[PDB]
Amino acid sequence: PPEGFPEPLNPTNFKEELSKGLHIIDFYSPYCPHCKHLAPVWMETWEEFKEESKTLNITFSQVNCIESADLCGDENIEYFPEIRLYNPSGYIKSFTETPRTKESLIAFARRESMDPNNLDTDLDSAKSESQYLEGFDFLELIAGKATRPHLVSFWPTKDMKNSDDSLEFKNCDKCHEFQRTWKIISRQLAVDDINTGHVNCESNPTICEELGFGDLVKITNHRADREPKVALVLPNKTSNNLFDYPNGYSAKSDGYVDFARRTF
Amino acid sequence: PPEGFPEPLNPTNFKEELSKGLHIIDFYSPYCPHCKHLAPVWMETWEEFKEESKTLNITFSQVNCIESADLCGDENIEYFPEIRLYNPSGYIKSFTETPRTKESLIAFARRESMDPNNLDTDLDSAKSESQYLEGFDFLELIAGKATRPHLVSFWPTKDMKNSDDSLEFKNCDKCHEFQRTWKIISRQLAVDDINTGHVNCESNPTICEELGFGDLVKITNHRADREPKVALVLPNKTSNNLFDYPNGYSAKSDGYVDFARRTF
Amino acid sequence: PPEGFPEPLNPTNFKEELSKGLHIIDFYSPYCPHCKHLAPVWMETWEEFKEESKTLNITFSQVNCIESADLCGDENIEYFPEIRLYNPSGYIKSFTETPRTKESLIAFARRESMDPNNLDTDLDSAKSESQYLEGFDFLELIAGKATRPHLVSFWPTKDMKNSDDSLEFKNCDKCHEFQRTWKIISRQLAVDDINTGHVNCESNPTICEELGFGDLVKITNHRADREPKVALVLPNKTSNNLFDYPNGYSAKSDGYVDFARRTF
Amino acid sequence: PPEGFPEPLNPTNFKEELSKGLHIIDFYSPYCPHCKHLAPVWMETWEEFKEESKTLNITFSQVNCIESADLCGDENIEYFPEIRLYNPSGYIKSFTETPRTKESLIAFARRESMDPNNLDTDLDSAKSESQYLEGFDFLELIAGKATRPHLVSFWPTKDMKNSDDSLEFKNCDKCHEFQRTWKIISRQLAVDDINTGHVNCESNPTICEELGFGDLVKITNHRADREPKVALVLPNKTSNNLFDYPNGYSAKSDGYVDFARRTF
């Protein structure tokens, strides 16, 4: 066991400990097949994360649900082991991604530190990582020239230089909300070395029409409302390398990040 | 009570009554508000439905959850009242639509009589109600000349004259499947006097491209797969009259049927 | 007579004058009814055309067939007056249209200046005036929404965006040839403010089938060869506004132009 | 605004529109004093130029540098407004002349249509406008009997009847080239009703010696090389009516045309 490795949180510690910063907690059981296959991974995770832990305000913790059974009942633990993110307000989300490695847990903590809503930090202080793609740039990506995956967003505008520029979108109720979402997505995907890009569909009509985003190219009074679109570009493939975002619109970044991270 | 009005089903009747045809059952309690403002409406529904009940093989029934509390318990009745569609194989779906009127309930039975999957009847014996729309025809609907709502389907082909013609769709995994679905949709919506149409996007490149369906127009090597698109045209409106089907793909007709029927 | 108005050409200046550019010559007799009610219209024209004469390299000239009788004899003048188009190479055609006005004469030179064969200029340098019509565009024209006449060409292909694009036509020996003809037609008719358009029948199967161009819609092994079809659409009429080109196929643009220019 | 008046060119159509013919483009800003008295002159220019536009392959167009700020940065726009000539290969020259009227803009288009280098047309098909002036004729011009200005060229030869005759010039490396230049000058000045003339200095030794072109009069081994000289004759003036072309030799016609057009 690593030197400073902390004891599980218990009913004397839980609320006092979660009242500052972020916590990634392993609700585990000493009575579990898979949870002793997590334990040594956890401690190495903890050990390698010691430095960033200080600077990102994120702590890896544990709860033994046998020694704290009523604690785990309050937190409504359904399975073992269960990995969760808390902030000072309480539960946020679970980390179900498999298989659990030191790499995957570290990436997840880094990913979550860049969500401004988690510690209500200020997104304006940060740059958007989203890259301005002219039509030609986007076509190069799709010709198989990407060396990393690119989540690309498409907009009913011609004036977006940075994805967070102040812009007035016509017949697009969700466009402004999605600029916040897109910026958060760009920074979270940057940890996984997945690129992001934005396309001005008004300046790239033929490309956006061919791709099925033709409704973003032009004002029409038959469609009341339009939404920004998102698609994934796979690196170093010359065909079938373009995949539209499958789920519905969301104000949350999570669906888009996890889509961009899928193995295809 | 109407003259022939059957009394509620009981444990001596239930499984035996449901072994043939379709049943639309009102699981109620004699001591609850919504189930006593429903009660006379059911009797309205039943008596008006007598002639169709036999030719459509659908029965309106009721269950007193006091005299048959264990029945309602076995079927997992959660609320009162609960209106449900049953098969000889068992539960199919619930009728949550409000307000419950004699018109809405009759419409539902007629609609459900037209799902081939309910009684394993043969869809191939029926005409598709879907009408062939040229691009020009569709713009006329969208200029405000629709006198009824039109749910329209858009396809990556040019050869679709009847929506259920024998066709080979290229790079479209779901298309064959959705012909069955689109055909059922056209028939169920004919009950509510809602029209349906199909468009050959290959015969209509500019229209489908501008509509945001440009991927159906043409083969490209970057998209593995395309799927047919669905849009609703509101009748007699000259603007904001075109609304895309919002949810994801389904092989079930129901979301598409309900989207086409909801108030805008 | 207008100020700079030239004297008739005579045998000493005649062939060296026609040795450059295009010439429109009025072979007349001073003792002729129709040849002296042409005279002032000829002077109106010349003066009105002064500015265009320089940039188009077209000259209105005259020959007195009594004072240069051996000249008119060499050219085999049949009647008086006879209006002829010459290039440096010699005679080209006569202008038989009546009634002769300043407008008709101006139009004629402008029309002839865009025939590439007159002064062997190269058509590749020019835009085609023929506009791309999809099915909906064409049906709008025929529903009566055209405000000028439209001569329309119909083709066995789906790949024609500009009427002069590089294309490989299947089972159509004349199509490549007719592309030049059609381009010259579009530019000559543009002088008379008549529009021209082209239709891809492979992209508009049902519209073209209904119109009687079904042989262009699809490859078949019954027909060895197909040719492009030509039809005229009259402006501002809601019925009986479509007229097929009546004469045979020609590599010449003029039969097609003159058809498009008829009074209805 | 006139009926068919085109909208400004933008980054999506700009390079496509310029791929054919000549374009005279008004690069403007809506927040520019000078660019708002041009706007109505521009729309007038366009409307009266509609007919010649077709036959000369010359189009008036615009780019708003507020709505197309990056295009104008790519085009290196320095001031507003900036009127420019483009061919398919790109920028040619700017139109800096003031004050801009409908007449000056039209005249400029006609002049540019007669430059063989702009659309690479064939100058040999056209006549030279340059008139043969014997010594006496030129002395008449200079006595003030010219009724239009006369740009006159002086040549080391005795054999020039037409300025584009096939000739061997002695000790004049540039003479052949300048025959092309002088021919272009003659046709372009013909648009503005400025005459051109040519003089054989070998046939007119005293006039040519006296004007300072004595070097063109006879073969001498003092000078390696001689060049044809150019002078302007002002109309209806009896003195100070003779002006040497002030700048250096050019194979380009533009300087000679502009000097001949200067008001004194």
Residue numbers in the entry:
A (entry chain A), B (entry chain C), C (entry chain B), D (entry chain D): 29 to 292
Copy out sentences from the published article reporting this entry, exactly as the authors wrote them.
One of the yeast PDI family members is Eps1p. Based on amino acid sequence, Eps1p appears to be a four-domain protein with a carboxy-terminal membrane anchor. It contains two Cys-X-X-Cys motifs, one in each of the first two Trx domains. The second Eps1p Cys-X-X-Cys motif was also found to be extremely resistant to reduction relative to other PDI family Cys-X-X-Cys motifs.
